[PDB]
Write a protein that binds this DNA or RNA. Structure first.
Lengths: 172, 119, 117, 171, 106
RNA sequence: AGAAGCUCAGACGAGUAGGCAGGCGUGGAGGUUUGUGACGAAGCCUUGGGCGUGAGCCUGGGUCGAACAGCCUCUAGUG
RNA sequence: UCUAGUGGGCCAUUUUUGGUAAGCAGAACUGGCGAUGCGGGAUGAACCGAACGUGAGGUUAAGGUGCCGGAAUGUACGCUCA
RNA sequence: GUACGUGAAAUUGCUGAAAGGGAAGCAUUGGAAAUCAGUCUUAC
């Protein structure tokens, strides 16, 4: 059969009984909710939830408001706010999947270069289709935040804690 | 009698036994596993087979119960000089009836020798 | 199964730090008033069988192999079928000629050498 | 015999040795510690001053019972002495080292005492007679001295790289 | 400059200990504004860290961090027990810690 | 499946005087290993590595210059 | 069946004798220390709790939670001024 | 190099580093600084 069999009878793992079942996200993370990003490069940003993915939330604060593109954000790194909901029923969310946000496979330890960092960037890498999707979701999201007062600039601002603020007493 | 041999040579002095501090290795020129054990004991098993390397050529050794008194014709030699696959089917064929479970061990041994030969 | 060490620091003999005539090698305190023998709080611990390591990971190097001492090529060929269980370790009294010969023997076997360099 | 220190490379140095010299090892150590690091010419000026009681050798380690003096203040110490036997030996060795540098072709203006060490030589021993018919040791502590004179004396993560590029290059 | 600090300020009080025996594996942390165990329940499971500064540049950074998690409340006055990946140095008694707002559930 | 092996389960674990058991180390003897060695044995030094609960053991580098070791048994002026 | 060590004990509870009394002398029953660390009583051989393989988590005992010191400058009702 | 094979420890000097308010040593946990191996890179 095969060539050059190992000199050790392989130990097959016992059949595991761990079945993957759908994640039950927080009851306050409904689509269209305004959320606060706690970690990452966009910590303190305010964003509008588009859809709930398998584990995380596909979310973007309108790129023309605060410059946060469409990203997956894990539901444990957001503080959902009680701000008035934004209509996200009219925006397509079926094309935002794990495959859509998936990175390129590497399967090797070679990486890193000054030219590598000169590569990627918004100028390169960023597909025109990704830019078009960001512009399309912006077109479908801006009218709602324009209509409800003070929410456009609220999304532009950045959340921060001040002296004497106690998050357990504070509600968002 | 075969058990007498093992009780004499297995647990104590043997020229092919290498005891170090917690374990036993069997370098015997007609063993496959490399470890010391009756099931694999070459001297104490009357019907048993092995493979070893020689000058780029693989050799399979066998011995029976009939020729025990004559050491010169006691072991039987065959030489192999082909690729691995065919070398496997030879041991498979030569042992599909003879040892019981040495088929897999000498397939493993032939594996390691052929990696030696290529290197 | 990864290798876990119940204890990493050696059991140094009591008062070996204060007296040079008393060596680091562990000696069991027989003294009638010995604080360490009586296990006072704050004193040094003593070797116990509870400190023994897992039978699966005992005698195993951090890479999972067991360093098997090697003095000639025939010692290397003993590890022909156990190249994922043992690692060749060339003895200190082996000359440079056999050291090179053992290294090429072990690299042919695919057996790792702990002190190849 | 080889010296203690990595220098004594004969291209740019000189050295001089003395063995079994019958003078006190403790006084020799104090002299060596005092002269270690100063230039050869200024070392000679200091040694003549010690011989003339114009400067004193500070006693730092073996100072038990050593009297106080005003000539120790330039070394920030109170205890200092004028060991003339030890200084005479050190003067002879320094002259020998200077002669070695002369024959070797070095520069006398720039030479400094790079290394000087005193070691205990084997004790010669003698007898002294005590009260009640008792005898004990009258040991002598010689010194080995050696002197050497010489001349002169990151990877970045993907996020870090992108942050650095977008901040520095883009602006 | 008040557009940052997504964390809550806390102070490393001591190790978890009896009268004479210390247990450096877990520490006692006083989170500011946390004045009862009922309030400590909100901070349970948050990500706490010790941030300090060093002269050597590890990966081009002067700032290095030891991470940890709030495990349980301690006492009645709002102090919490914290477990760190590296046990906090005993010289940090009275030093400050950052308690982030994640993993969030609010 | 070195059946003197492999495997499953449960309970349990302080200790002077003292008893018993299994191991580590040393000198010499028989057997053995196509055993190591002037291309460096033994010994010694070591802010190198590795193993063992431990007695200990192995190893890298340095020094050194003539012998020494593993295993099975025998023995003792053996720690 | 063979044999080791031992054949100076001491303390406490309770009962009790000699005694002016004693950190005194003498016994009875049990528990201990001796031979035993650990938690506590600041500290202590016999007091309190608990008797010990190497560890992780949880929970308690005795005892504590103003600060040293881990833990309420807690709750309720009084007493006390020295 | 005859103060002669090998050349241990005590103890000593030099150098480098470090520490130190009436001892020092130790144990435990981590920091800092120095030092270093494994692992990996591959195999299928």
């Amino acid at each position: 059969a095969a060539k050059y069999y190992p000199a050790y009878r392989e130990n097959v793992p016992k059949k595991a009984r761990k079945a993957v079942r759908p994640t039950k996200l927080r009851a306050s993370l409904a689509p269209g909710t305004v959320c606060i990003l706690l970690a990452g490069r966009f910590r303190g940003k305010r964003v509008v939830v588009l859809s709930q993915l398998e584990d995380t939330l596909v979310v973007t604060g309108p790129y023309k408001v605060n410059g946060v593109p469409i990203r997956r954000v894990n539901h444990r790194y957001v503080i959902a706010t009680s701000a008035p909901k934004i209509d996200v029923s009219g925006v397509s969310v079926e094309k935002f999947t794990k495959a859509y946000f998936a990175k390129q496979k590497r399967s090797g330890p070679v990486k890193k270069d000054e030219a590598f960092f000169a590569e990627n960037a918004p100028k390169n890498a960023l597909p025109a289709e990704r830019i078009a999707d960001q512009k399309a979701v912006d077109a479908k999201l801006l009218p709602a935040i324009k209509a409800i007062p003070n929410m456009k600039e609220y999304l532009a601002a950045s959340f921060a804690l001040s002296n004497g603020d106690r998050p357990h007493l504070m509600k968002f | 009698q075969d058990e007498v041999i093992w009780q004499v040579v297995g647990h104590e002095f043997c020229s092919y036994r290498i005891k170090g501090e917690a374990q036993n290795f069997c370098r015997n020129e007609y063993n496959v596993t490399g470890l010391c054990n009756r099931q694999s004991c070459p001297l104490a098993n009357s019907r048993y087979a092995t493979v070893r390397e020689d000058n780029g050529k693989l050799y399979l050794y066998m011995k029976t119960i009939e020729r025990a008194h004559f050491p010169s014709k006691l072991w039987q030699r065959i030489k192999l000089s082909k690729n691995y696959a065919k070398a496997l089917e030879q041991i498979d064929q030569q042992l599909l009836y003879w040892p019981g479970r040495q088929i897999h061990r000498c397939k493993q041994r032939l594996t390691r020798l052929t990696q030696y030969l290529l290197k | 199964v990864n290798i876990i060490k119940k204890r990493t620091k050696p059991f140094k003999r009591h008062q070996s730090d204060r007296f040079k005539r008393v060596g680091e090698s562990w000696r069991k305190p027989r003294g009638i008033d010995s604080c360490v023998r009586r296990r006072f709080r704050g004193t040094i611990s003593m070797p116990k069988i509870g400190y023994g390591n897992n039978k699966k990971t005992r005698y195993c190097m951090p890479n999972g192999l067991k360093a098997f001492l090697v003095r000639n090529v025939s010692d290397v060929e003993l590890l022909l079928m156990h190249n994922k269980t043992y690692a060749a370790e060339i003895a200190g009294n082996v000359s440079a000629r056999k050291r090179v010969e053992i290294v090429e023997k072990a690299r042919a076997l695919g057996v790792k050498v702990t002190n190849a360099g | 015999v080889r010296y203690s220190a990595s220098p004594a490379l004969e291209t740019k140095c000189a050295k001089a040795r003395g063995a079994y010299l019958r003078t006190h090892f403790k006084n020799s150590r104090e002299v060596a510690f005092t002269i270690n690091g100063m230039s050869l010419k200024k070392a000679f000026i200091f040694l003549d001053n010690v011989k003339e009681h114009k400067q004193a050798v500070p006693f730092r380690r073996f100072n038990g019972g050593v009297g106080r003096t005003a000539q120790g203040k330039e070394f920030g110490v109170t205890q200092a002495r004028w060991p003339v036997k030890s200084v005479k030996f050190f003067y002879d060795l320094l002259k020998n080292a200077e002669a070695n540098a002369e024959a070797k072709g070095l520069d006398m203006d720039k030479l400094i005492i790079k290394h000087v060490q005193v070691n205990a030589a084997p004790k010669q021993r003698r007898r002294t007679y005590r009260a009640h018919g008792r005898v004990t040791a009258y040991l002598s502590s010689p010194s080995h001295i050696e002197i050497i004179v010489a001349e002169e004396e990151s990877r970045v993560s993907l996020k870090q790289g992108a942050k650095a590029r977008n901040l520095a290059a883009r602006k | 400059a008040q557009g940052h600090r997504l964390y809550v300020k806390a102070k490393h009080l001591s190790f978890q200990r009896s009268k004479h025996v210390i247990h450096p594996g877990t520490s006692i942390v006083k989170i500011e504004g946390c004045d009862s165990k009922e309030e400590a329940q909100f901070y349970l499971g948050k990500r706490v860290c010790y941030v300090y500064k060093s002269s050597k540049a590890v990966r081009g950074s002067k700032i290095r961090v030891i991470w940890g998690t709030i495990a349980r409340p301690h006492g009645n006055s709002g102090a919490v027990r914290a477990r760190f990946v590296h046990n906090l140095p005993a010289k940090t008694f009275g030093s400050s810690l950052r308690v982030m707002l994640y993993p969030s559930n609010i």
